[PDB]
Design a protein around this ligand. Structure first.
Ligand SMILES: CCCCCCCCCCCCCCCCCC(=O)OC[C@H](COP(=O)([O-])OCC(O)COP(=O)([O-])OC[C@@H](COC(=O)CCCCCCCCCCCCCCCCC)OC(=O)CCCCCCCCCCCCCCCCC)OC(=O)CCCCCCCCCCCCCCCCC
Ligand SMILES: CCCCCCCCCCCCCCCCCC(=O)OC[C@H](COP(=O)([O-])OCC(O)COP(=O)([O-])OC[C@@H](COC(=O)CCCCCCCCCCCCCCCCC)OC(=O)CCCCCCCCCCCCCCCCC)OC(=O)CCCCCCCCCCCCCCCCC
Ligand SMILES: CCCCCCCCCCCCCCCCCC(=O)OC[C@H](COP(=O)([O-])OCC(O)COP(=O)([O-])OC[C@@H](COC(=O)CCCCCCCCCCCCCCCCC)OC(=O)CCCCCCCCCCCCCCCCC)OC(=O)CCCCCCCCCCCCCCCCC
Ligand code: HEA
Ligand code: HEA
Ligand SMILES: CCCCCCCC/C=C\CCCCCCCC(=O)OC[C@H](COP(=O)(O)OCCN)OC(=O)CCCCCCC/C=C\CCCCCCCC
Ligand SMILES: CCCCCCCC/C=C\CCCCCCCC(=O)OC[C@H](COP(=O)(O)OCCN)OC(=O)CCCCCCC/C=C\CCCCCCCC
Ligand SMILES: CCCCCCCC/C=C\CCCCCCCC(=O)OC[C@H](COP(=O)(O)OCCN)OC(=O)CCCCCCC/C=C\CCCCCCCC
Ligand SMILES: CCCCCCCC/C=C\CCCCCCCC(=O)OC[C@H](COP(=O)(O)OCCN)OC(=O)CCCCCCC/C=C\CCCCCCCC
Ligand code: CUA
Ligand SMILES: [O-][O-]
Ligand SMILES: [Cu+2]
Ligand SMILES: [K+]
Ligand SMILES: [Mg+2]
Ligand SMILES: [Zn+2]
Lengths: 226, 180, 459, 65, 107, 230, 62, 65
């Protein structure tokens, strides 16, 4: 959005030193129990394990492929929530302009709390009036006293929580078959051999499953000076 | 009727000047020992420790509210499904008698009326023109007089005598040509 | 905390609180002046202590202008509502806002301390040289206060200008009023600082700008190049308040919003180019005098448009609404009073009329009707409108018809007679006067004691 | 500031400026004025008294004084 | 200049011959100084103040919609007295236009 | 969702700085004033640290806000110089026929204009490198040499001038205008001594501020040179 | 922005209420005096309650 | 917290200690004294009296008191 500042380096990828060292437990943790860093590396390890196995991709369904990469198959419930989330974020630093509100289609006023201050400017052209500010509280269909424009408050609330991308992913995504560490090892040997590492994440991940320091050059990789 | 008599009972006249006993009879300056009131004084005011000496904005009692999933507790709406539709019942504020005291009866009638706007665009535009140009005319009526009177002060006159006047602290010196 | 707070609304309260405190000292000085002027003779100041009177009038003027009305109308109400009117969480520069109020207090302490410790002499609030530069150290202390005050004013102006970058709604007329005052400060203050530094150079660095072959009239140009913009920096915030009160209380949308805004912009530009109407009697060139007289009379046009737009706001309002609220009465009283002050301003604007009326009590009454009556009442009306939002109590003002009536009557008893003695004529900045001017001076003095008594009834 | 209200004169006595003021008195009398620029402690104690007499009287006065 | 919303004669035609203008009182009620209970502490007096806000009040019309407390300026939209942090969720100024895009509709 | 602004709730530098200012007034020794100036520098630097630490908010409008403040400040610097030019020209009618020696139009103006121009070229190269995410170590030391020569030349001029401030308003205005320029030159030293390469690059308000200020001071000297020397 | 100042937070419940040893609710200082005198007048004023509403504000002698 | 919602919560909820108000009024009273006390001190310093007697700088009748 225009109100956001510049992408960080982390916005693209995370450093491999932030990979959890207990990979064996990481790949067995349920999604609802994974933190932001743990969830990043669960998806990256599992997603790259399937993508770096070309011979199996054509026989893998899009439902299974999306699960491996950690992408959520969309549906009307989740689409509604995500859309209203992105609409809330956009309105943080953007103007609020849209069609005239009526009983059939009230002006939708997203909010996290139970109230949001709103102003009615009336219709277009000569039907526009001076700003009339009012407090839009949930559970009431508001009508402007001047132009009769109907307003309504929409709350981004779900089960004692507000709506977030993390909440939407946890509520609607279902964990599939438990990730098999044999796949990690098999793909690891595929792209990492004879001092050539073409899957750096899988070389670090396999090292942790082995106990940290087992694979060649990994003790030297983990030895820091400050 | 007298509306004050309705809520007279709630208003019990006070005993202490400024509503506090002498500090000797009760030390309101100390923090309350009641569980869950460590941030309050005995008289109910916020304790200096909570607000000044150990203010959280200064790094004391560091306790991040947001949880691991980036969530905070949010209270949901009063939802009531009905007629094949999910409804939300809004929270209505309590009767103003509870909060203010007067009994909400015999309220004078103030009808709904849309904003009192001035109409007749053509007429309004002419008035606004007059609001600006009637003063402009008056100024123009003063302009010519102002020029003339200014010119009059600064007129080369055939003066025949000179008096020099010097102002000093605190008296006026006068120099005049003496008759020959 | 108390001093560390950065909350813009708390700081707004501090500005009003400090203006009232410093205002007590201001009013006391005014009572001294009026008591002295009750008859001819010495009443409360000895003839050997006439220097004290000169200091009383000097400090009265300086404190009321820079430490009371300006901190109240440009620092108090603005810091409390402007970020709300702009639908923004808080002021753009939080830390700067805190230091500004602290600076004002510190400069006030310096001034009053200089009363106690230094020899008491006066040179007017206009600090004309060479008199200002041949005085004692009290003049040096006053200069430090003004320069320090200037720092607070400029940084506060920078703070308000930044609202344009963050405003999330519509720039209402009141917001426009503050922005333009901020612009007027950014352009006028740097010139004031320069001339004040030159006063210091002559006082403290053996400079010779204000001794022969150096033109003393130079100071008056640079001073008044800030002086008159100052009187509009003090009135424009009041105009902004009047607009909000009339629209809100009458439930009527502002009429000619764009003309109101463009009238404020116009007053500022014109107010930046008319300063020499304060220098009519020095002996300027005929064409200069005519230019300044002409442009000074033009300021009435934009000022007149605003007055008439206010009148139509009150016209036609519903009768059922109670009209005795103190805020509404004060707002209406402002229109009635400001017209008197402005019209007399136009009279003095004619230079030939001004020759007779310069340095007379007619000028006093003119700027009192606008400031001591109009600006004060506007600040009161604005605070009164925000009583619920601010939340103060323990006063009987909100609905007090006695206070409004007594104030209006008695304030006019003080300054209406000062117009009369202007054609008598009684010079300004004097304490002794001829016995044939006692009647009017006595009447005004009776008015001053009475107004003070009415200030006690609010509690 | 040299001020004589009856003669319509109010001229600032500024150091460095020798301001010219022209006048034409029409009636005899004594016209009283006061300094009109705060000038220090005794700003209120330097009045301006001008007496206008007939030209024949002025000549006799000037010859003697 | 603003002169109200434009009305077409068709919109002024009633569906019944007995329709008149609804007589609903828009006086919110009788009020005075907010009166706190002595028993209430600082926290509970704060709740009391929050429940006495006129700008949270409205008038319900015959069709169930409510006309809220409205003001020309947002100064009257914060709790009285003003809290330390007022507009946490940015107040939304709603502008209206005739532009539309197809994605918003479904056939 | 987060708040649009991370509000700053408390600050104590303001009290200290305001007290430091009072010490300048309430003192009986000029040594106290010297050490007080150091205290001011320290606490103004803390305020600058607060500005750098506000970068953690990732607010897009912060750069714009600070940039426009500098614009206002530059404007105030320009208007202060205008007031001195005004003071100078008001008494113009009493210049050039008094028994004083005004300055030559050959030596001082040329070497100074040539010197200050080189200062601009260095700052311009710094800006160019700033655009190219590059650094050249020698640049800052060229500025130090330029400032040293400027200080060396101005000191000798004042000491060898045979007319004093009390001789004429012409001399007072000459000395004061030149001093005012020097003070702004010294403020440029205060700013430039911290120049370094920061890896956040063009979201750093320091770089744009330095470029604007240096150009202002050099341009101001062109106006002074025409008024006084030429 | 994950982990930034929340747009909205619910108030925590108020601290436990205090009773006296006899069960009387503990009262706290209150600057709303009931002045003693013989006057009982009640003045009511229609007041602006925004744009489309009013409130009947009453002032009581006590 | 609910106690922190309102700025100056104790005062707004009408629980503040009255001493805060007393200090504010005292501060204003002290500010006023800065105009009266130096008046008395300066009068005595240059005259020997704290305050004059009306018209004691002018000629008075024998029975004047
Ligand atoms: C050998 C030597 C070698 C060399 C050595 C060199 C050494 C160099 C040293 C350099 C540094 C020196 C300076 C160090 C400063 C340190 C600052 C700092 O970090 O402090 C943190 C420190 C934080 O404190 P803390 O340790 O956390 O705890 C504080 C307490 O818990 C209290 O908590 P709180 O902060 O919440 O409470 C504060 C508040 C609490 O509130 C109250 O007391 C009650 C509520 C207010 C009552 C009503 C007051 C009137 C209304 C005022 C409205 C405007 C207010 C504006 C904001 C406040 C501005 C002060 O009250 C006050 O303290 C002041 C209130 C306002 C007073 C002024 C009001 C006007 C009076 C006018 C009278 C005359 C007319 O700051 C303070 O709290 C105190 C700062 C004090 C600064 C004083 C400066 C005074 C300058 C006066 C003028 C000077 C010239 C003339 C003087 C003449 C004297 C005879
Ligand atoms: C901050 C210093 C300011 C000094 C101002 C002095 C003004 C007078 C004229 C000086 C002429 C030299 C150039 C000055 C301009 C700046 C040069 C520069 O940018 O250097 C960058 C250069 C490398 O900078 P970088 O950041 O590493 O690389 C930047 C570029 O990316 C890569 O840079 P680049 O490779 O493209 O180079 C740029 C190029 C651009 O410059 C030119 O091409 C200009 C040519 C001008 C020719 C004039 C004829 O500059 C040079 O090539 C400079 C060569 C300097 C070699 C110094 C080696 C050590 C000398 C030690 C002498 C010790 C004497 C002891 C005597 C004892 C007696 C008892 O910096 C240095 O090497 C440091 C020294 C800079 C020059 C200092 C000159 C001092 C002159 C003292 C004379 C004493 C005479 C005593 C006589 C006694 C008789 C009894
Ligand atoms: C123009 C006038 C008329 C106007 C009429 C129209 C008005 C319209 C309405 C205007 C409304 C504006 C907006 C209002 C918003 C109010 C918000 C508010 O209340 O904020 C809460 C704020 C604080 O409440 P809080 O939140 O509970 O604060 C708790 C504290 O922070 C913490 O509590 P704590 O207890 O820990 O506090 C610390 C406390 C600790 O305090 C203590 O321990 C005090 C101990 C007792 C001391 C008592 C004084 C002793 C004096 C002795 C003198 C001896 C002289 C001997 C002479 C001998 C001669 C032979 O204080 C300190 O430690 C520092 C105190 C510093 C400030 C006081 C300075 C006094 C003057 C000093 C002068 C020094 C001169 C030196 C010269 C040296 C030269 C060498 O309230 C106040 O500060 C009080 C405000 C009260 C008035 C509000 C407005 C009411 C409506 C207007 C009424 C009319 C007023 C007229 C002006 C005054 C006339 C006199
Ligand atoms: C906020 C305060 C304030 C305001 C608004 C004004 C406004 C004006 N003032 Fe000012 N003035 C002062 C404060 C103020 N003044 C002070 C403090 C001094 C003395 C300082 C000192 O000397 O120490 C002073 C001195 C002063 C003098 C000096 C007289 C002298 O030194 O002898 C003059 C003369 O030109 C003058 C003129 C004006 C004019 C022409 C206006 C105009 O703004 C007035 C405009 C308003 C109207 C004209 C009325 C409303 C308009 C209409 C009703 C439209 C119809 C009217 C017409 C068509 C004319 N003022
Ligand atoms: C806005 C500034 C202001 C204000 C309010 C006043 C108010 C008053 N002034 Fe004013 N006065 C000046 C500014 C002001 N004056 C100036 C600038 C001069 C010229 C200085 C000079 O000659 O060098 C002057 C000169 C001056 C003299 C001339 C003395 C002389 O030089 O010979 C006299 C007495 O005749 C006088 C009397 C009064 C009186 C009796 C009041 C008032 O007391 C009338 C009664 C009104 C009130 C008592 C209410 C005031 C209340 C407040 C100001 C507080 C408001 C705060 C809030 C609302 C939060 N004043
Ligand atoms: C606001 C920014 C623009 C301000 C422009 C103001 C110009 C007003 C013009 C007034 C005028 O005619 O100037 C005369 C008048 C002097 O007149 P006399 O003393 O009679 O001398 C004339 C012959 N001896 O000029 C001045 O004083 C000009 C003062 C300089 C203003 C410079 C403003 C700089 C702003 C940046
Ligand atoms: C190609 C570049 C051209 C730049 C032109 C810039 C023009 C800016 C003009 C602004 C002010 C104009 C005012 C009207 C002109 C009046 C000039 C004039 O009369 O000057 C003399 C007169 C003084 O004389 P008296 O007071 O009568 O007696 C003095 C006895 N010792 O006025 C002045 O003092 C002029 C002061 C203003 C000069 C500086 C103007 C601002 C400079 C900005 C620089 C950037
Ligand atoms: C002087 C006060 C100027 C205030 C307005 C300009 C402030 C400004 O831009 O300062 C920041 C700016 C760069 O900081 P950034 O981290 O890029 O930006 C801050 C967050 N975006 O800092 C500087 O300009 C560096 C200052 C270093 C020298 C300080 C010298 C202080 C001298 C005081 C003498 C008395
Ligand atoms: C007699 C002169 C006027 C005295 C006066 O009104 O002082 C009021 C003022 C504030 O008191 P209250 O308004 O009652 O505030 C406490 C909480 N309600 O009282 C004081 O400051 C008492 C001390 C006054 C000393 C004056 C010297
Ligand atoms: Cu001389 Cu006044
Ligand atoms: O000053 O008008
Ligand atoms: Cu003016
Ligand atoms: K007298
Ligand atoms: Mg004068
Ligand atoms: Zn509408």
């Amino acid at each position: 959005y225009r109100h956001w500042h510049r992408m960080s380096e982390d916005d693209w990828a995370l450093p491999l030193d932030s990979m959890p060292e207990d990979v064996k437990t990481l790949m067995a943790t349920p999604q609802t129990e994974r933190g932001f860093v743990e969830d990043y590396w669960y998806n990256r390890i599992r997603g790259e394990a399937t993508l770096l196995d070309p011979e199996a991709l054509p026989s893998k369904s899009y439902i299974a492929l999306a699960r491996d990469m950690g992408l959520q198959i969309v549906d009307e419930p989740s689409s509604h929530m995500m859309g209203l989330i992105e609409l809330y974020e956009y309105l943080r630093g953007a103007s609020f302009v849209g069609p005239f509100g009526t009983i059939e289609n009230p002006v939708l006023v997203p909010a996290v709390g139970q109230e949001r201050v709103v102003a009615c400017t009336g219709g277009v052209g000569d039907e526009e009036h001076f700003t009339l500010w009012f407090r839009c509280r949930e559970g009431f269909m508001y009508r402007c006293g001047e132009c009769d424009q109907i307003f309504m408050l929409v709350r981004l609330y779900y089960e004692d929580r507000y709506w977030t991308q993390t909440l939407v992913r946890d509520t609607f995504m279902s964990d599939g078959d438990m990730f098999d560490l044999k796949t990690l090892e098999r793909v690891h040997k595929m792209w990492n051999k004879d001092e050539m590492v073409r899957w750096e994440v899988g070389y670090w991940a396999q090292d942790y499953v082995l106990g940290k320091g087992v694979l060649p050059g990994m003790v030297e990789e983990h030895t820091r000076v400050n | 009727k007298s509306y004050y008599d309705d809520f007279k009972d709630r208003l019990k006249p006070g005993k202490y000047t400024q509503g506090r006993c002498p500090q000797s009879e009760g030390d309101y300056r100390q923090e309350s020992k009641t569980i869950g009131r460590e941030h309050l004084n005995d008289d109910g005011t916020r304790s200096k420790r909570y607000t000044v000496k150990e203010a959280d904005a200064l790094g004391y009692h560091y306790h991040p509210p947001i949880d691991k999933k980036g969530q905070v507790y949010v209270k949901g709406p009063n939802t009531v499904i009905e007629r094949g539709q999910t409804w939300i019942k809004g929270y209505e504020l309590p009767s103003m008698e509870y909060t203010y005291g007067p009994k909400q009866e015999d309220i004078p009638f103030y009808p709904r009326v849309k904003l009192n706007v001035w109409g007749n665009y053509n007429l309004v535009m002419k008035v606004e023109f007059l609001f600006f140009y009637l003063p402009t005319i008056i100024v123009f009526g003063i302009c010519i007089p102002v020029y003339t009177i200014n010119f009059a002060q600064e007129e080369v006159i055939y003066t025949t005598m000179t008096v020099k006047v010097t102002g000093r602290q605190w008296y006026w010196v006068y120099e005049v040509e003496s008759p020959t | 905390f108390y001093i560390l707070v950065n909350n813009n609304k708390r700081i707004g309260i501090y500005y009003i609180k400090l203006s009232i405190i410093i205002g007590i000292l201001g009013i006391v000085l005014s009572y001294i002046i009026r008591v002295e002027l009750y008859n001819s003779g010495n009443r409360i100041i000895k003839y050997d202590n006439v220097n004290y009177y000169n200091m009383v009038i000097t400090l009265h003027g300086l404190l009321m202008i820079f430490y009371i009305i300006m901190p109240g109308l440009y620092g108090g109400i603005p810091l409390y509502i402007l970020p709300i009117l702009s639908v923004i969480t808080d002021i753009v520069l939080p830390r700067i806002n805190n230091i500004s109020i602290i600076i004002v207090l510190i400069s006030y302490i310096v001034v009053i301390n200089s009363i106690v410790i230094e020899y008491n002499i006066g040179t007017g609030w206009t600090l004309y040289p060479p008199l200002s530069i041949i005085g004692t150290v009290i003049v040096n202390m006053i200069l430090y206060g003004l320069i320090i005050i200037g720092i607070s004013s400029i940084i506060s102006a920078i703070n308000f200008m930044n609202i344009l970058i963050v405003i999330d709604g519509i720039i209402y007329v009141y917001i426009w009023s503050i922005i333009i005052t901020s612009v007027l400060l950014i352009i006028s203050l740097p010139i004031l600082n320069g001339i004040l530094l030159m006063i210091l150079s002559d006082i403290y660095f053996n400079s010779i700008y204000f001794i022969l072959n150096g033109d003393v009239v130079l100071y008056q140009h640079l001073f008044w190049y800030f002086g008159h913009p100052e009187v509009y920096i003090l009135i424009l915030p009041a105009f902004g308040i009047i607009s909000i009160i009339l629209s809100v209380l009458n439930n009527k949308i502002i009429f000619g919003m764009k003309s109101m805004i463009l009238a404020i912009i116009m007053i500022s530009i014109l107010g930046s180019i008319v300063w020499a109407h304060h220098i009519y009697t020095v002996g300027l060139e005929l064409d200069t005098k005519i230019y300044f007289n002409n442009l000074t009379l033009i300021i009435s046009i934009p000022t007149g448009n605003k007055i008439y737009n206010w009148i139509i706001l009150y016209i036609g309002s519903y009768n059922i609404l109670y009209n005795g609220y103190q805020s509404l009465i004060f707002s209406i009283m402002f229109i009635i009073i400001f017209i008197i002050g402005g019209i007399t301003g136009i009279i003095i604007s004619i230079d030939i009329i001004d020759i007779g009326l310069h340095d007379t009590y007619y000028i006093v009454s003119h700027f009192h009707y606008i400031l001591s009556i109009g600006a004060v009442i506007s600040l009161l009306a604005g605070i009164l409108l925000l009583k619920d939002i601010i939340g103060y109590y323990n006063v009987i003002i909100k609905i007090n018809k006695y206070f409004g009536l007594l104030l209006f009557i008695n304030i006019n008893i003080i300054f209406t007679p000062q117009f009369i003695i202007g054609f008598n004529v009684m010079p300004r900045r004097i304490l002794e006067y001829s016995d044939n001017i006692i009647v009017w001076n006595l009447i005004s003095s009776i008015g001053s004691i009475s107004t003070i008594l009415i200030l006690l009834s609010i509690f | 500031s040299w001020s004589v209200p009856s003669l319509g004169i109010k001229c600032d006595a500024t150091p460095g400026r020798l301001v010219k003021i022209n006048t034409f008195i029409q009636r005899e009398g004594v016209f009283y004025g006061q300094c009109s620029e705060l000038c220090g402690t005794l700003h209120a104690f330097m009045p301006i008294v001008v007496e206008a007499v007939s030209p024949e009287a002025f000549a006799a006065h000037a010859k003697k004084w | 200049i603003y002169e109200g919303q434009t009305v077409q004669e068709s919109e002024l035609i009633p569906q019944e011959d007995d329709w008149v203008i609804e007589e609903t009182n828009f006086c919110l009620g009788r009020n005075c100084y907010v009166r706190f209970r002595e028993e209430d502490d600082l926290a509970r007096r704060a709740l009391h103040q929050m429940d006495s806000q006129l700008n949270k009040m409205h008038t319900r019309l015959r069709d169930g919609t409510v006309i809220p407390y409205m003001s020309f300026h947002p100064d009257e939209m914060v709790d009285r007295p003003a809290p330390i942090h007022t507009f946490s969720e940015k107040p939304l100024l709603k502008w209206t236009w005739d532009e539309t895009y197809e994605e918003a509709y479904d056939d | 969702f987060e708040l649009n602004i991370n509000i700053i709730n408390y600050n104590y530098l303001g009290i200290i700085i305001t007290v430091i200012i009072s010490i300048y007034i309430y003192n009986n020794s000029n040594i106290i004033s010297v050490y007080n100036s150091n205290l001011l520098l320290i606490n103004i630097n803390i305020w600058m640290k607060y500005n750098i630490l506000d970068m953690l908010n990732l607010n897009v409008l912060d750069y714009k806000i600070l940039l426009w403040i500098v614009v206002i400040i530059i404007s105030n610097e320009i208007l202060l110089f205008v007031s001195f030019y005004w003071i100078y020209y008001h008494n113009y009618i009493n210049y050039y026929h008094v028994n004083i020696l005004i300055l030559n139009s050959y030596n001082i103006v040329y070497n100074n204009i040539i010197l200050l121009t080189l200062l601009s070229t260095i700052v311009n190269i710094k800006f160019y490198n700033y655009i190219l995410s590059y650094y050249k170590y020698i640049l800052s030391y060229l500025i130090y040499y330029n400032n040293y020569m400027f200080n060396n030349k101005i000191i000798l001029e004042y000491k060898n001038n045979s007319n004093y401030t009390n001789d004429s308003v012409y001399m007072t205005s000459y000395f004061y205008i030149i001093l005012l320029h020097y003070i702004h030159i010294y403020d440029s030293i205060i700013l430039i001594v911290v120049y370094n390469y920061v890896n956040y690059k063009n979201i750093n308000n320091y770089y744009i501020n330095i470029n604007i200020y240096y150009h202002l001071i050099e341009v101001l000297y062109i106006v002074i040179s025409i008024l006084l020397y030429l | 922005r994950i982990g930034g100042p929340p747009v909205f937070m619910q108030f925590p419940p108020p601290p436990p209420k205090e009773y006296l040893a006899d069960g009387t609710p503990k009262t706290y200082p209150l600057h709303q005096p009931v002045f003693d005198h013989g006057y009982t007048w009640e003045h009511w004023y229609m007041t602006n309650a925004g744009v489309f509403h009013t409130v009947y504000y009453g002032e009581f002698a006590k | 917290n609910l106690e922190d919602h309102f700025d100056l919560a104790e005062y707004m909820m009408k629980m503040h200690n009255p001493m805060s108000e007393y200090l504010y009024w005292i501060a204003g009273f002290v500010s006023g004294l800065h105009g009266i006390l130096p008046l008395l001190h300066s009068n005595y310093y240059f005259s020997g009296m704290f305050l004059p007697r009306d018209n004691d700088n002018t000629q008075l009748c024998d029975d004047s008191w």
